[PDB]
Design an enzyme around this catalytic site. Sequence first.
Site, PDB file in Angstrom:
ATOM      1  N   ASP B  25      10.265 -15.090 -17.275  1.00  0.00           N
ATOM      2  CA  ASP B  25       9.757 -15.119 -16.019  1.00  0.00           C
ATOM      3  C   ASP B  25      10.798 -14.242 -14.971  1.00  0.00           C
ATOM      4  O   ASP B  25      12.154 -14.725 -14.690  1.00  0.00           O
ATOM      5  CB  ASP B  25       9.812 -16.376 -15.535  1.00  0.00           C
ATOM      6  CG  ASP B  25       9.292 -16.538 -14.013  1.00  0.00           C
ATOM      7  OD1 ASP B  25       8.745 -15.491 -13.430  1.00  0.00           O
ATOM      8  OD2 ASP B  25       9.141 -17.438 -13.331  1.00  0.00           O
ATOM      9  N   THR B  26      10.433 -13.010 -14.875  1.00  0.00           N
ATOM     10  CA  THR B  26      11.118 -12.135 -14.136  1.00  0.00           C
ATOM     11  C   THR B  26      11.154 -12.422 -12.616  1.00  0.00           C
ATOM     12  O   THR B  26      12.186 -12.047 -11.917  1.00  0.00           O
ATOM     13  CB  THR B  26      10.513 -10.681 -14.095  1.00  0.00           C
ATOM     14  OG1 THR B  26       9.173 -10.828 -13.636  1.00  0.00           O
ATOM     15  CG2 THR B  26      10.726 -10.010 -15.458  1.00  0.00           C
ATOM     16  N   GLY B  27      10.124 -13.344 -12.222  1.00  0.00           N
ATOM     17  CA  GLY B  27      10.309 -14.055 -10.970  1.00  0.00           C
ATOM     18  C   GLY B  27      11.194 -15.148 -10.402  1.00  0.00           C
ATOM     19  O   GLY B  27      11.317 -15.686  -9.688  1.00  0.00           O
TER      20      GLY B  27
HETATM   21  C1  LIG Z   1      -1.307 -18.676 -10.410  1.00  0.00           C
HETATM   22  O1  LIG Z   1      -0.582 -17.575  -9.989  1.00  0.00           O
HETATM   23  C2  LIG Z   1       0.843 -18.188  -9.387  1.00  0.00           C
HETATM   24  C3  LIG Z   1       1.431 -19.311  -9.595  1.00  0.00           C
HETATM   25  C4  LIG Z   1       2.692 -19.475  -9.157  1.00  0.00           C
HETATM   26  C5  LIG Z   1       3.203 -18.684  -8.216  1.00  0.00           C
HETATM   27  C6  LIG Z   1       4.880 -18.956  -7.776  1.00  0.00           C
HETATM   28  N1  LIG Z   1       5.835 -18.891  -8.828  1.00  0.00           N
HETATM   29  C7  LIG Z   1       5.916 -17.636  -9.861  1.00  0.00           C
HETATM   30  C8  LIG Z   1       7.268 -17.645 -10.322  1.00  0.00           C
HETATM   31  O2  LIG Z   1       7.244 -17.211 -11.680  1.00  0.00           O
HETATM   32  C9  LIG Z   1       7.486 -19.030 -10.449  1.00  0.00           C
HETATM   33  C10 LIG Z   1       6.875 -19.583 -11.607  1.00  0.00           C
HETATM   34  C11 LIG Z   1       6.340 -21.160 -11.637  1.00  0.00           C
HETATM   35  C12 LIG Z   1       5.768 -21.773 -12.996  1.00  0.00           C
HETATM   36  C13 LIG Z   1       5.871 -22.991 -12.801  1.00  0.00           C
HETATM   37  C14 LIG Z   1       4.426 -20.886 -13.539  1.00  0.00           C
HETATM   38  C15 LIG Z   1       9.168 -19.345 -10.258  1.00  0.00           C
HETATM   39  C16 LIG Z   1       9.717 -19.786 -11.292  1.00  0.00           C
HETATM   40  C17 LIG Z   1      11.226 -20.306 -10.938  1.00  0.00           C
HETATM   41  C18 LIG Z   1      11.726 -19.757  -9.682  1.00  0.00           C
HETATM   42  S1  LIG Z   1      13.700 -20.052  -9.513  1.00  0.00           S
HETATM   43  C19 LIG Z   1      13.655 -21.390  -8.340  1.00  0.00           C
HETATM   44  O3  LIG Z   1      14.466 -20.103 -10.635  1.00  0.00           O
HETATM   45  O4  LIG Z   1      14.033 -18.620  -8.827  1.00  0.00           O
HETATM   46  C20 LIG Z   1      11.112 -19.293  -8.829  1.00  0.00           C
HETATM   47  C21 LIG Z   1       9.585 -18.899  -8.954  1.00  0.00           C
HETATM   48  O5  LIG Z   1       8.723 -18.371  -8.105  1.00  0.00           O
HETATM   49  C22 LIG Z   1       9.357 -18.310  -6.637  1.00  0.00           C
HETATM   50  C23 LIG Z   1       9.650 -16.625  -6.627  1.00  0.00           C
HETATM   51  C24 LIG Z   1       8.021 -18.370  -5.817  1.00  0.00           C
HETATM   52  O6  LIG Z   1       7.613 -19.832  -5.982  1.00  0.00           O
HETATM   53  C25 LIG Z   1       6.656 -19.601  -9.034  1.00  0.00           C
HETATM   54  O7  LIG Z   1       7.044 -20.704  -8.803  1.00  0.00           O
HETATM   55  C26 LIG Z   1       2.754 -17.459  -7.907  1.00  0.00           C
HETATM   56  C27 LIG Z   1       1.306 -17.162  -8.354  1.00  0.00           C
END
Ligand SMILES: COc1ccc(CN2C[C@H](O)[C@@](CCC(C)C)(c3ccc(S(C)(=O)=O)cc3O[C@@H](C)CO)C2=O)cc1
EC number: 3.4.23.16
Lengths: 99, 99
Positions: B25-27
Amino acid sequence: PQITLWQRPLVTIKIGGQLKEALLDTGADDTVLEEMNLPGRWKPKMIGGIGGFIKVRQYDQILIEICGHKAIGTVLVGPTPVNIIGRNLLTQIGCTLNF
Amino acid sequence: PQITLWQRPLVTIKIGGQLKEALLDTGADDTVLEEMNLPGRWKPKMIGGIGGFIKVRQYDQILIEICGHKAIGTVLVGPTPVNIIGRNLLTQIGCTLNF
Ligand SMILES: COc1ccc(CN2C[C@H](O)[C@@](CCC(C)C)(c3ccc(S(C)(=O)=O)cc3O[C@@H](C)CO)C2=O)cc1
């Protein structure tokens, strides 16, 4: 281009003629942008993030330019902490992970 | 390898003698795994985003093997809906985004 991950992979996108900053997010199935105005009708969708689920507005066939690459696809709008480019559009611009 | 984004980029990891499936996960700033015990001291942390925040336990200097590549770093443990490999470990295995 090749983007390393020592910092957040933030890029400039253009949507509705306006520039925004967004996160290239391989963990996101879909693309979700902070509250903004988009044309046409929308449909309801629930998406699950790190913290739980939220309601967003789903717009289809939206023109969006990502780091200079033109895409046309589904864009969700809702209370996200950052503009997120997910796999639905990363695939349109030819993005892969490599190591 | 070159990993497509047509599907979720899921890989096998090895951590604390256990094989697990995890999302590249790059995000994600952080690496977050489902509940498990790890060696050493830990401290509480709150991480969040879409859906809100969750409380996790932070362990430092943890060894993980990701898709064959060894990497050391901070690992968070808690009620994440999926195992996530974040940027802090993606950098160590030489992972980049390319388009
Ligand atoms: C269906 O389309 C979407 C679903 C979720 C999001 C929001 N996202 C995408 C990030 O990859 C994620 C992954 C969450 C995982 C359970 C699938 C994530 C993981 C870790 C971290 S962390 C706390 O380690 O930095 C942050 C993060 O996303 C944030 C940037 C936004 O919530 C998230 O929550 C979008 C589309």
